[PDB]
Structures are given as C-alpha cells and as structure tokens.
Design a protein around this ligand. Structure first.
Ligand code: ICS
Ligand code: CLF
Ligand code: CLF
Ligand SMILES: [Fe+3]
Ligand SMILES: [Fe+3]
Lengths: 477, 522, 522, 477
C-alpha cells in the first residue's frame, strides 16, 4: 500500500525526464482508487508515445493484419509493401486453427508483394493485380483475399480499393482492401478500428438477402477471442455444454462463412471489448443483435459469466448451466487445493496491451495472489474505467509505460512475479524476478475456462517456485 | 476435463473426444469446408512438376520469403559498439518487430529506440521527432553514442538525416560533441545484410572521414576485422581466439558478443562490451582490414579502400578447411606472425573427424538456404565432405554471387547436380524438394513447415530439416554455436553426421520389419 | 536386383519383395517359428507388472549388464601417462576386446600388448610369458614405462606379478632401472572403474612409496588432480581451463586427452602427452590432492592420505551449478587464488540458460544409468533444473553410494518419486520403463534396444534415449563433449531441452491432426 | 617383380626383434610364388603368438560364442563367467537375423553368469542351475540354451556337462555345454573346432530317427555363411533362383531346427572352409552328404560357383542357372562400366583373418585392382595352399602379423587401400591411407552375390577417391 510512497516513487522516477517528456508522462501514471469511476480525472490514455522512450507499443498494421485479419484460416492475407512487415509477423502470434496449410488454410504463411525501388517510384497497382492473378492460380481453394497496407502504400498514393473492386468482380472473389498503414494512429488499437470497418464494409453484409441458414433461439457468436493456444476451443465447449449453438467465432480458428453467418445469430458474446466493440455496436444498430461482455479467466469469473449468459435465455439453458457448473466444480476445486498453498500471498505486476491486464486479475486472486500494479500499452479510458474497480486500493496504474519507468517501478515494488511481453522478459529474468509471458502464455495450452485454469495454476506455480531463482548470487560473492 | 495430477496442455487436451466432437460439429455446421477428397487432390497437385512450373512462373507474388529488411541489420550493427543506442527514425511498429525478432533468436534483452513518427510527420517531415527523440534518449538511457537508421516511411517522405541531426545540435537538443552517426536504410532495397553494411559504413565515415590527415597505414601494428551480419556468438569468439593464438594484434569492429550474452546475476545491464570509439578512430592506422563476409560488405569495402587506403584482401568467408587455411595464411602474411602449432593440430583433428565420418557423409543430397556468404561457405564445406548440394537458394543473392557459386560447384565432381537459385522464396524450395527430393534441408526455422508438408505426402518422402542459420526460434541456445574456422567446421560436421545417423535409427527401429539393420555400432 | 544409379545396401534392399518372398518361404518352411499371435502375447506379457516382479526376483541370471571388467579401466588409466605401454598379463582375447571396445568409442588407435598366456601356462604359471613379453615390448615398441595389469585367468592361477617382474629384472630381460608398475585387476571383483583405481594406486605407489623421506607437503605450490575413469576429452580440457583461469598451479595425473585425440597429418603417433614420471615423483610435494570421482577412487584415497599425508577434501564430482561452485571454492581455499571474474560470468551465463529453458524442463521424468559418480552428478543437476529422476540405476553401485544418492534426493521436492537401484541391469530397467513410463532415458548406446522395445508397444509408449555416458558406439564424435563444470552443464542443458523440443515437434507434425500445436517459436 | 626388394624389406623389419622373437617371426613372412603348391615350405601358421608383440588375434571364446554359436537366433547363449567377455562381444558382429528380440530371438542380448569372487572360490554349478531355471521363467519361447565357458570355468573345477545333462532332461530342453575357454588354443580357430564338436555331439543328431520332413532331390544347406550385412540372404536368393531349396544356413539367421534338418539335404555348400570344414567332413562320413566350397565375391567367382553347383545336379537346374546368369549379367556389367576406370590399377593390402583375404581377391580383380598383400590372423597351412594360387607372383604373404610389422610393410609398399579390422583402421587413416573394414564391411552389408558386388564397388570407390585424403598436409608446411 502506502499511496503516498507510490506517488513519491512516481515523482522520483519522473525526475530523469526532460521537461516536455516528464509533463506528458505524469498524466499516464496514477495511484488506484477503487471508488473513483471516472478514470479521465485520474489517468490519460490513447495518446502518441513520446519519442526516444523505448515504447512497447505495436503499429496499426500489427493491430489489423496481426490481430484481427491474420487468424481467419480460409482467407489469404497479402502484406502489401516491403518484405520486412510480414516476415516479422509470420506465425508470431499463436492463433490456433484446424486445416491443411497451403491448401485450404493459410494462417502461418507470409504472402507479400515485396516492393523494390521501382514499385516505390512507379506504384504497385499493376503489381497488385498480377499478384492477385498468381494467387488465384497457385491457391485455388482460398475463399477470399485481404490486402493489408504497409507504410509506403499510404505514403506513395496507391489506390488499392479500385484494384480490389475490379479484380473482385472479374474473379467473383471477395477482395478486402485494408488501409492499415503503421504511421496511422498511435498504436495497434487504431488498426483494430480499421480492420473492423473493413469487415463491416466488404464481408459482413454478403448474406443480408440470404435466408437459407436455419436459425435457433440459442444462436450465439463468440466475438473477440483469438484462440491463443486453443483458448476459444476451451471456451466454446462450455458454451456447447450449456445448450447454446456457436454459429461463429471471431476470429481465432475463424472462417469467412462464419463471419457472414454472424448477422443470423440471436446474441453476441464479446470477449475482447477493445478490438471488437466497433463491429459489435454496428451489428446491434443494424441487425438488432444484443451483445454482452464475458470473462472466462478463472473459476469465479467463468461461473459468473456462464450464469449471466444463461440468464439471457429460457429456463432449460439455466438448468444446463447449473449442470455444467456442478460438473466442473470438483476439478477446479482440486486445482485450488493443490496450488493455492504454493501461491498464497504472492504479488504480481502485469503489463499487457488491452483487456487482459484487467481480465486475468480474478484468476490470480482465485489462487490467493495479489495484483499490485497493472498497465496497458494501448487501452482507452473506458478500459481504465472498467479496470479501477477490479484493482485494489493504492495500487499502481500505468499507460504506455517506458522501459526505464517499468524497470524502476519493478526495482522499488519488488514483485514476486511479472506478466508481460517478450521484450520485457529477458530484462526481468536477468534481475532475478520470475517472468510469465502474458501475450503467448509462454507457448502453453489455453488459459480460458475450467480446463484452462488448471494449466494456468500449474504454469504460475512452476515459474514462481523454480529452483534457479535461488541461484543468481554466486556463493563466493 | 483435466486430471489435477496429470494436467494436459493444448496438445493433447484437444485430442480428447469431447473436443474432437466439438471441432467436427463446428466444421460440419458453419465452416463450409471443402470436402476432404478435394483437399487431398489439391495437395497432391501442389506436389507435382506442373505445379512447380506454374510456381516458378511467379513474377509479382512472393510466398514465405527468406530475408528481412535493412533496418534490422542496421540495428544489429549498431549493437556492436560500446554504450551505443540503436535509434531508428520513423514508425515505432518497426522497432517493436525488430526487438521481438532478435529477442526470440538470442533469448536475450535487445535495446532499440524509435522517434514514433505519425501521419502529421508524414505531412511535415520528422525533424521535431528527431530533436525530441535524441534529447529524450540521451537523458533517459545515457548512451555514449546514438546510431541512427531509417524506417521505410522516413525514406519515402525523404527525411534528410544529416540536416535533422545538425539542426538538433545547433539548437541545443544534444551537445555538439556527442557522436551521432547515421545511415539511410531503405526496406525496399536489398535486405538486412545491406542494412548492416550501410550502418557500418556510416559509423566508419563519421569517425574517420574528417581526420585522415594524421593517419599512417600500419602504424598501430594491428589488423581490422569486420564481421558483417553475424547471429552466432561462437563466430566472434573463435575469430578472437584464433587471432590471439597467432599472437596477432587485431581490432574487431561492431562486435556485440558481450551485450548479447550478459549473465543473469540479479542486475540488468543494458550495455556491455562493444567496439570503442577510440578503436574506430584509430582503425585507419591498422596494417590492413579483413572483411569476413565480403559479399554484403561492398560499400564498406569501397570506403575502406578509397579513404583508409587499405589493400583489402580477396578472401572468402573462413568456412570449412580450404578457406580457413587461406584466411590464416593471409593473416600470417599481413602480420608477419607464423601459424602456431596449436592451430596446425586443430586442423589435423578436423581432418581426423572427416576421415572418421566420410563413409556416412558421402553422396548425401542437401537443399539449403540462407544469406550469401554463409550459403557459399556451407556449399564449399559440403563439397569438401563429398556431399551433394542439390538445391542452393539465396533469396537476397545477386548475379555475380551466383557466378561465383557456379564456379565453386564446377571445381568439384560433387557439384554436377547442383542448381543455384537467386530471388526465389521458400515456396519455390517446397516445390523443389517435392519434385527432386534430397536427403536433408539445411536452413532456419521456417523450413520446419516444409518438412511438415513433405511428411504429409508420406514417410518415404519426408525431408528432415537441419537448423543452421538465422533465425532459429524453435530451438534453445543454438545461437551459442560456431560456424567459422576449424571449430565451426567440427561442429557442423558433427551435426550433419549425427542427423544422418539419427534418421537411420528412426528408419530401422521397427521390430521384425526393418530392425535387422538397427546396429549397435555405426 | 540393383539399379547402378541408385545402389541400395542392406536397408532397404531386403525390403524389396523378392527378398520378402524368400524370407517368408524360409520362415514358413524350415524355421519352425512360433505363431505371431503367441509372440505378440508373450511380448505383451513381458511389458507387464507381473513380469516385472518375476524379473526383479532374479538372483543368478544377469541380462544386458551395464558395466565392464577391471582390466579395461586399468588400460585406460595406463594410457594417461607419458610413453606408457599398457601391458596385460594373461590371455590375448581380453586385449583384443579391450582395444576394439575403446577404438569404437573414441574413433582412435588404442595401443595395448598381451603375453598371450596358454593352457600349458595354466599349470606352470606365466613367468616365462612375462619375461619374453617385457623384453619384446620394450625392444619393438620402445616405451618409457610399462604398466602391468592382470586378466582373470592370471588372477585365478595366482600369478605373483611382483616376483615375476623382479625375476625379469634380475635375469636382465629388462633393465633394473626401467619402471614397471603393476596392479592386480580381477574381473570377478568390482568393475572397470575399480580397475582404474587399482592401476592408479599401483603407479603412484611404485613412484612414491620408497622416496617419501625428502617430501614436504605443499613445497611445489601445486594441487594434484586425479580424474578417475573419464571417457570425455572435454572434461580434461575444462578442468585444465578452469584451473589455468584461476592461476592455480596444478598437476593432472593419468591424463590421456592428447593420446586419444591425435591429429591426422600423415603420421601415426603411438604416444602423445600424458603425465610425466617427474610429475608423479613430485606429486607428494603438492599442497593437496583432489579426486574428481571419489566414489571409485577409494583405494587411491587411502594411499594418498596414508602415505603422502595430504588432507583430501570431501568434494563431490564437479557436475552442475552447486557442485562446480563448491569445487571452485575449495580450490581457491587450498591455493589462495581468488575466483576470477571470467568464471563468475560463465556461471551467470549458465544461470541465464537455466532461466531461459526452465518452462520446458520442469517436471520431465527421466530414467538414467551409468557409473556412480556420473550418475549422482547427473541426478544432482536434474534436480537443480526442476526435473524428476524416476529410475536411477547403477549396476556397479554399492550400499553407501545408494545412501548418499537417497540423501541427495530427499533434499529436494523433485526427488519424491525417485527410486535408486544397485546391482540391477538393463533388462530390469526395461521392465521399469514399461510399467512406470518416464519421459526420457539418459544413458549409453545399449539403451537404444530398450527404446526399440517401447516403440513396439506403441508410439504413445516410446521412451526416447539421450546418449550421455560410456560407451557411445552408434553416434559420432560425442566423446569430444564436456560434462564437468559450467561448460559441461551448459552442454547437457542444451542437449536435454532440445531433445524435449525435438520430441514435441515429432508429436505435432501431423497435418490437420496435431499440427495446431506445431509452433514456429518455442 | 622386385622379389629381392620384398625379401630385403622382410629382413630390415625383422632387425628390430630380439633373437627368439626374430627367429619365430621370420617363418611367418614369405614372398608368394604361384607355382608352389605346398605352403609349409615357405610359411608357418597356426602357432602361438609371440608375447608383448601386439597381436591382432582373439581367443577361443570369440571363435565359439562370437562366431559360430552367437548367430543362432532362437537359442539363448549364456556367457558363463565374469561380466567382461559377453559385454565386449555384445552385438559387435553384424550377423543379420529376422525376429522379435527378447521374445523369440536373442542375438543382440548378453546373457551372463556375472561371476563374483564367491563363485570363483566355491564354484558356479548351483548358480548355473539356478540361472537356467530363471532363463526358463523369463524367456519361455526360447528353443534351446548354450553355455559358453570363459577362462575361469576351465581354470577352476567347474563341470558344466553334468549340469547341462541334468537340467536338459528335467526341462526337456536342449542345453549345449561348450568348453571354449579363451586360454585354449592360440586363436579363434580352436573356438571354431570346439563349437563344431558341440554341434555334432548335442544338436545335430536329434532327428536321426525322424523321417517326417519331406525331402527333394534339390535340397542343399549353406554352411559357414554368417549373414554379415545380410550376406547369406543375398546368396540364398541366387540359389533359389537356380531352382534349389535351401533347407538350412549355418549360422547367420539360423535356427536350431535348421541345424537339426541339415542331415536330410542332398548337398552341403560351405562358404567358409575354416569355420565349418569340421562338421562338413563329419556329415560326409556319417550321412553320406557331399560338400563343396564356393565363392560369391564378385561376378566371376559367383558365375563359376553357380555353374559348378548346378553341375552337381540335373539338366533342369543347369538350364535355370544359365537363366540366372543371363538375368544378372547387365547389372554387374553396368557396375563394372561405372566403377572400373575410377579404381583401375589400384593396389590393395588385406589382413582379414581365416577365409576372407583369399576369398575377396577376385572381386578386387573384377574392378581392375591388384592385391599386393594378403594376410591371415589364424589360418592353417591349407588356407595358404589355396591362397598361393589366388595371389600373384612376388607379393607379400604374412601370418599373425604384428602391429610394428604391418605398419612398416605399409610404409614401404605404400598401398592405395588397406582392408582390415577395427584395430588397424584409425592407425592407417592417420597415416593418410584409405581403409576399409573387411569384417563388418564398415557397416555396409552385403558384399555377397550380384547385389553385393554393386555395394562393394560403390564402397571401394567412395573411400579410395574421397576428397579428404588430399588434405592431411597443411598448406603452410
Ligand atoms: S567365420 Fe571367421 S575374422 Fe570364416 S572367425 Fe572371423 S564372418 Fe573373418 S575372415 Mo571377423 S574365418 Fe567369418 C571370419 Fe572369416 S568373425 Fe568373420 S570377418 S569368414
Ligand atoms: S510501422 Fe508497421 S511494421 Fe513498421 S514498416 Fe510500418 S506497417 Fe510495417 Fe515494415 S518493411 Fe521494415 S518493418 Fe518497417 S522498415 Fe518498413
Ligand atoms: S581370453 Fe576370451 S575374452 Fe579374455 S577372459 Fe578369456 S574367454 Fe574372456 Fe573376459 S571378464 Fe575381462 S575380458 Fe578377460 S579379464 Fe576375463
Ligand atoms: Fe538469455
Ligand atoms: Fe579418430
């Protein structure tokens, strides 16, 4: 605790900065007050990163191509521009899927136009058309093409919309142009917006006149789950056990037909508010489909979410929900009995980009673990509004944290465990603090649902209690 | 469901029938998936020669490239100098990707900064981002030097780095004495090795161009060594060890071995080791300069010969037996130090390992890919071993390099079945290993997918992958290996022969079927 | 039939149908083979717990032992001294077997001689063979020293080596000043490590027992290091490198690294390197003596403490983090040299590799076997990594060693499921890995057969083998590896984590079936 | 051809020895004359090895357990004594077999008494009986047991014959005691003799009263082929292509039933005279079965052997033999056309033990290669009698050669290639001379027959012409 100490620590850490940088940085650091429900009066977010500060934040192309569009298996996603962008993002995110790669699924592949000097000087529209022809020749079972723009596309004045329209009608193939140039916005979050707008404008309404899909009163769509290590599959089974039918799954293990099917479904279950609220609101206004947020991190939150979801339907669904809860109670109770004694009392500091810094807090508390600091790369003020009530009093809050800032906070607070991105992990392992990679689950099987909680508890136990952390100090020194 | 005493990860929790039934229902109900027979037919078609002809007719589409963009190499070069912060001028998304890429390969902290140019900068240029970024970086991370490279967006808008940095110095954002070398590194041109070359030439020019008057060639009795883009720590270490064994004064330039191998002792060290500014300033006083990877150090070669007046030797990368011998003889001739007996014994021990494993190595067929110098060194060593490089691919290779490799292949009877491909990607290589199946692949982690594809055709068609090169994300600690010198040749030979033997044990493990050839002694 | 362009050797020429038809006719016509259903039933029975009970009730029968006989270790010890011919008094078949065993493991020439004892000798003794053998060996091979060990036949007939050698010297067959140390090495008692201990004690006694009057402890300011039976060259190299880095004067005793690693330069060198006779004569003047493998150097310990009056430290084998730390601290305390910063950084780098790979290593279950000191060092390191040794077997272990290993296991939460077995063989271990399946085996090449057996039960039951130990006939150049110190710990950690990852890639390579978990980055 | 120079070289090499050893070794070194038919007048063989001269020879246990009895797949062979013997010989010889190891076949396994000092002091007969019971318990599908004695069993007063008899009748199991103690004899050849005597006395006559096996006029038995790298399988196919029926093969891939069936055949084809001539003569005397030696190394010898074997039978077999020869002629002709020029004119020196040095000369000659040196570790005078006609004039002959002798001879003669065992390989590879293992075939089976010749030519070409041999001298020296 010690709110005054945490505020004093924020001031001493800020002392290093030049005047301009420090004044902007102070607005992005805060001491939590759970009673406060308007985070704007407390913290500022979604602003440009100060230059030279080693910001964690990714570009808009990472938000669109890497996050939203890349997971769908059937569609071929062309990184339009120089070679670097798609190569660094090739299969770096574990959006799991079922398919035959290179034949009907293309998630782990890198398709790019690979611009050279002449493409920059003369333009790449003819190259893009020829590329689309070659794609149709060599990958006949693809069900659609998206064109994700990199920085030069926007800067050289290329018109990919006209190429998409012309080639689309000629081949009878859906071609989705996405203007996700990295220079746009300040973070991956603007790319989410652009990707959702492209989904709305080019894919979502293809079956508005079609009524050949048979709908049931129990039709739901999972929105905003990317199946990280099979996370959506762990969540879908529970929904299927409650009696509901999951028509679509955005966008992990997703297909273009599922996206088109989403207007038919009665209810939208949104997991990541940050990336998919845009299209969820659009569908509520256009189709009258209600949407609600849920949380499947840890037993308490998943039980609450299942009951709330079942409350939207009739009494048979509620009966099945109680049956599912009763069926899974002994397993997560055994997990708690095994692992809570090993983790009780430990303190965690979590830095991630959106939703998860607040989504995983309940699962940590289910194991008796205290979150004393949390922060976001690119969340908006509504995310902090949802975050302040879920964190304890006088805990540290931090938006777009600089590498120096995070290192000093960790030195002062001295957490038992840190959850953060890959760039952070090597630095904290050197300092002797156990590190868990929140973005990729450290290449581990899913953290969602009751099955996920077992893996979560085992993973947290093994890193925190590992014998090597007791060995960084040589005996002679 | 989970059993608390034996918790299951995604593999094989998904293998459980409840999950299998769920996935079957999902596929059958809402994916509108092509029938499995059509999938099988299309896959079989993609393994054919007709598909290969269509594939090699590609002109616009690149699939699964085997290269990166210039600023990554620029950052790696900058990391090799003491207390130097790599600065990339342009969009921050690039820096996030570069840091993530390098962090996965070395399992180590990678420090780089961006000035975070946005659309407003795309309209009015990046000069305000330059001034504030340089001030902020110097204040916060306290480097002795800041090396500036360029993202593609900065290159397209035509930001003038020299003018920006000078204006930052004349307006008091950074001190006038503070060293800020820079280089233009366009993503569209060349690849990451080109970026390494550009960054190094920028740094060398910054420290030597205006002070050549007092420089006398050979006065400090050392030899400069330029490593190029190197992702193996062992290569730096073996070069230093061999030069020290000969008693040869040397000045390694752009060496990052320490900062990419810091210990875990409870403190984080952002900087460690690296070439000092004094070494770079005194470099024109060396006897000569050796370029370890000449095929991507051409601009550096031009600067070193034109300005430093060093007669740079025509040396291949010191890989294998003959090229290591030539490198050592050239070093001895330049410095006047005889080759010591320890290196003679090391060479003899490598020859002993060659005679020991030649029967298993002879005639094996390899496909392989990577960067030009590494590829040609590996081809040379494979020929020395009696192996057959069949498919040689260098996505970032040029025509002169291709003639050099063809000449190397023509000098041996083991190169008669080799073809060299430049500008081709890994999808081309997938077609090549399907239609003309070799025994093994040598390349980076991106080859694993190709292996998977071949196993799908059948066990008798599977082409195992041998991980040598950059990047190696799946394996742990392979970046500590060595590929240069006699030590590197020994490591590579051991890796190759034991991959052959491990495959042979895999094929003869079936009881009463193939295990008659499952010999204890090989 | 053979195709001249693609000749096929035994695998897979036998797989051709003409050969399959031949073999089927042979089996069906003249082998009177049990029906395949009976064979399958018996195999399944041998994988059961009831079979394991019967198997562990064995008292007279040993199947697939994991040890050798004393004279092999005696020969290895003798090879570690300068210009020394290992001489084995007894039958020549033993020497043929010893030479061939060592030749396959190191891929190097092993020189040993025999007096070729005969049935006539069994009743009259071997003294005529001894006198002729000593004369002939000294004339033709010109050795500085001849170290004499004994075959079981010589031990059974009770040949008196001391009297035989003395009579050879009084006869004049060999000069009275020519050094001929000897040791009795019975095959029935102990194993090869016991033979190494006996040979070393014989040599040390021969050179020091009668000249102790002028010896003062600590006068030469060195530390004696006794390695025991070691089959890794890298272990000798690392121990020398660590001691030289500390600036500690040392005298390695019985070091053969040079003889077993001669270069291939066009001449055969029968002798190379080795402990000199002057070093052995001056050994009692050292500060102290360290035994690297104390559990098979007990007789040497008794001699060194009783005669040289050295206070031999209680040190474990320097394997893994804690025991390497303790070894270095003891060396520093004995010699007065502080531990340098290079070793501190090396230790930190090992700790960094541990933090990097701990998630993949944690909780993995291992069976393992080998010699006592190596087994206990490996168990200690595995516990340090968070791994679970399940089945620990040492065929040549004793009860005191088992008590020490049990104490080590009790000190960690990761030893709760471990059982230690002494006097058991590899057939016992086959039952253990069937009934209580671990994740991997660690051991020598003889484990490959066990792996084959488990694969026959099913792919989900297969236990992969990791080759660490002696001997390693199937693999090439693994005898160059290191297992001691921080360097050896680094090598072993890399081997383990990459075996785990390679198995995981094998299990997730199935297209559209398990390849959802076939991740690029691990 | 420089006959005086070879004689001078023998004298200079002998100069190093003391008087007794020199006088002994001078009788074991000869210059070959083809015209001489009695080899005793120039070279002496089968004598005791000189002490301390680093001989290559093995012992009688290696000759019996390692060579003759070990290949029998369905029997369990107990190494009776201390642990060393069976461990060094475990799976060191490549005798190929088809079976399920540990269930019905036991070739690569090491069964041993593991004798300890108590067993030395008080004897191991009761331990042997208990061992036999344990074997019956744990390996129920074994079809027989052999007990191979090591050096202590003969030296102490064990009586394994009585144990074998008592246990055999009680279990109704064939138990074969073999007195193959290593100190008997001077080499492996006495081991061969002892093993053959055990075969005749305990196994061969089981079916003398049985007449339930149906015999044909074309019944033959392969004797002396151990199936190294499947060498016997390569030979058997040719015999079955000629129309003959192979009832048994001794002892590679052999079974005890085949041995028991052997006295019913019409002809005995002995591939190795030295190992099996004993039992072949016994069967000729007792059963009236004729036996003939044959050679399947290289096309010339193979064709000659096939024609002679067919000449032992009627005209149908001879017509089939001409068909087999015609069928295989193009394949070995192509082998010759591809590999003959590369190895033409090359000179070879071979030290291989009992049968191989004379046997492989024709294959080398088929490739245009000249065998200057032939040597035997343990051959008898009759082997040298056959060798002198096969060897060319003025070539070197050598019996039980020492390490010094063979190294000096190689230094003077300077062969292009050397074929020998594992204890000479590394010595001559460090000398810069290509080396082939002629016992295990450098782990490249088989060298027998037409299929064998193609592997043989490929292996000789790949070792002699290998690039590394040009690299042992550093450029700077
Ligand atoms: S049995 Fe003999 S030594 Fe005739 S003991 Fe030896 S598998 Fe040799 S020359 Mo090893 S009489 Fe066979 C032999 Fe020849 S083991 Fe093999 S190759 S043809
Ligand atoms: S912020 Fe984002 S990742 Fe950066 S470029 Fe812009 S869209 Fe792309 Fe691309 S090729 Fe390399 S990595 Fe850049 S310098 Fe250009
Ligand atoms: S000549 Fe032959 S191999 Fe030698 S013992 Fe005798 S039968 Fe055997 Fe055996 S255990 Fe070791 S290897 Fe010997 S010393 Fe005894
Ligand atoms: Fe690391
Ligand atoms: Fe060798």
């Amino acid at each position: 605790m010690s709110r005054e100490e945490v505020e004093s620590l924020i001031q001493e850490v800020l002392e290093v900065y030049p005047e301009k940088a420090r004044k902007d940085r102070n607005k992005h650091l805060a001491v939590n007050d759970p009673a406060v429900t308007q985070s704007k009066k407390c913290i500022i977010s979604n602003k440009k990163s100060q230059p030279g500060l080693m910001t964690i934040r990714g570009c808009a192309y990472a938000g669109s191509k890497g996050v939203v569009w890349g997971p769908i298996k059937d569609m071929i996603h062309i990184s339009h521009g120089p070679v670097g962008c798609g190569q660094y993002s090739r299969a770096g995110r574990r959006n799991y899927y079922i398919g035959t790669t290179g034949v009907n699924a293309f998630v782990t592949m890198n398709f790019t136009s690979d611009f050279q000097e002449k493409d920059i000087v003369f333009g790449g529209d003819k190259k893009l058309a020829k590329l689309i022809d070659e794609v149709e020749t060599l990958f006949p079972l693809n069900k659609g093409i998206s064109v994700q723009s990199e920085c030069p596309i926007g800067l050289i004045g290329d018109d990919i919309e006209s190429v998409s329209k012309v080639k689309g009608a000629e081949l009878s193939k859906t071609i989705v142009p996405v203007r996700c140039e990295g220079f746009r916005g300040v973070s991956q979050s603007l790319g989410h917006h652009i990707a959702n707008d492209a989904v709305r404008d080019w894919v979502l309404g293809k079956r508005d006149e079609d009524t050949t899909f048979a709908s049931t009163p129990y039709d739901v769509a999972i929105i905003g789950d990317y199946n990280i290590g099979g996370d959506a599959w762990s969540s879908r089974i529970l929904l299927e056990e409650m009696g509901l039918r999951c028509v679509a799954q955005w966008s992990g293990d997703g297909s273009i037909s599922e996206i088109e099917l989403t207007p038919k479904v009665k209810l939208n279950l949104v997991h990541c508010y940050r990336s998919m609220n845009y299209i969820s609101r659009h569908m509520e206004e256009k189709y009258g489909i209600p949407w609600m947020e849920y949380n499947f991190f840890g037993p308490t939150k998943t039980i609450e979410s299942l009951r709330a979801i079942a409350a939207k339907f009739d009494e048979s669904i509620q009966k099945k929900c109680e049956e599912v809860i009763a069926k899974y109670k002994p397993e997560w109770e055994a997990v708690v009995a095994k692992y809570r004694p090993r983790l009780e009392g430990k303190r965690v500091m979590l830095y991630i980009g959106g939703l998860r810094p607040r989504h995983v807090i309940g699962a940590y508390e289910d194991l008796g673990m205290e979150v004393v600091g949390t922060g976001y790369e690119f969340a908006h003020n509504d995310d902090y509004d949802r975050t302040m009530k879920e964190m304890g009093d006088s805990t540290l809050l931090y938006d777009d944290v600089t590498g120096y800032e995070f290192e000093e906070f960790v030195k002062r607070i001295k957490p038992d465990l840190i959850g953060s991105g890959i760039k952070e992990k090597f630095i904290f392992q050197k300092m002797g603090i156990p590190f868990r990679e929140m973005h990729s689950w450290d290449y581990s099987g899913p953290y969602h649902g009751f099955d996920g909680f077992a893996i979560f508890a085992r993973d947290m136990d093994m890193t925190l209690n590992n014998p090597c952390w007791k060995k960084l100090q040589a005996p002679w020194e | 469901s989970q059993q608390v005493d034996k918790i299951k990860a995604s593999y094989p929790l998904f293998l459980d029938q409840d999950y299998k039934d769920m996935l079957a229902k999902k596929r059958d109900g809402f994916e509108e998936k092509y029938p499995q027979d059509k999938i099988d037919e299309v896959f079989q078609w993609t393994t054919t020669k007709e598909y290969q002809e269509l594939n090699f007719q590609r002109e616009a589409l690149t699939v699964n490239p085997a290269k990166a963009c210039q600023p990554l190499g620029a950052v790696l070069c900058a990391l090799g100098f003491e207390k130097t912060m790599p600065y990339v001028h342009g969009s921050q998304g690039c820096v996030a990707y570069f840091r993530s890429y390098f962090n996965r390969h070395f399992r180590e902290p990678v420090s780089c900064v961006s000035d975070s140019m946005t659309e407003d900068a795309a309209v009015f240029g990046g000069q305000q981002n330059m001034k504030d970024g340089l001030q902020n970086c110097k204040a916060t991370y306290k480097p002795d030097m800041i090396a500036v490279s360029t993202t593609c967006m900065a290159e397209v808008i035509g930001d003038d780095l020299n003018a920006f940095i000078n204006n930052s110095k004349k307006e008091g954002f950074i001190p006038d004495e503070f060293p800020v070398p820079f280089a233009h590194t366009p993503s569209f041109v060349g690849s990451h090795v080109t970026g390494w070359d550009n960054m190094f030439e920028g740094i060398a020019r910054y420290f030597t161009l205006k002070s050549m008057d007092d420089k006398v060639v050979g006065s400090n009795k050392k030899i400069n060594i330029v490593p190029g883009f190197e992702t193996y720590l062992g290569n730096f270490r073996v070069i230093k060890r061999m030069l020290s064994e000969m008693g040869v004064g040397y000045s390694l330039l752009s060496d990052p071995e320490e900062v990419l191998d810091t210990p875990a002792d409870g403190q984080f060290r952002m900087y460690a080791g690296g070439t000092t500014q004094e070494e770079m300033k005194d470099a024109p006083n060396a006897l000569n300069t050796v370029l370890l990877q000449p095929w991507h150090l051409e601009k550096t070669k031009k600067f070193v010969e034109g300005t430093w007046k060093h007669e740079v030797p025509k040396l291949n990368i010191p890989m294998g037996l003959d090229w290591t011998d030539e490198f050592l003889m050239k070093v001895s001739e330049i410095s006047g130090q005889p080759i010591p007996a320890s290196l003679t014994k090391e060479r003899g021990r490598l020859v002993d390992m060659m005679t020991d494993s030649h029967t298993w190595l002879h005639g094996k067929r390899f496909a392989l890919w990577g960067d030009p110098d590494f590829v040609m060194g590996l081809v040379k060593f494979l020929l020395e071993l009696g192996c057959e490089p069949v498919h040689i691919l260098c996505h970032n290779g040029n025509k002169r390099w291709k003639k050099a490799v063809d000449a190397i292949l023509a000098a041996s009877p083991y190169g008669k079945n080799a073809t060299v491909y430049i500008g081709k990607d890994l999808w081309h290589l997938r077609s090549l290993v399907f239609t003309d199946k070799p025994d093994f692949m040598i390349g980076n982690s991106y080859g694993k997918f190709i292996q998977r594809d071949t196993l799908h055709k059948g066990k008798e068609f599977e082409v195992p992958l041998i991980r040598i090169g950059f990047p190696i994300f799946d394996r742990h600690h392979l970046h500590r290996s060595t590929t240069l010198g006699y030590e590197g040749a020994m490591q590579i030979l051991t890796t190759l022969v034991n991959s052959i033997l491990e495959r042979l044990d895999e094929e003869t493990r079936g009881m009463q079927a193939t295990d008659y050839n499952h010999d204890l002694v090989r």
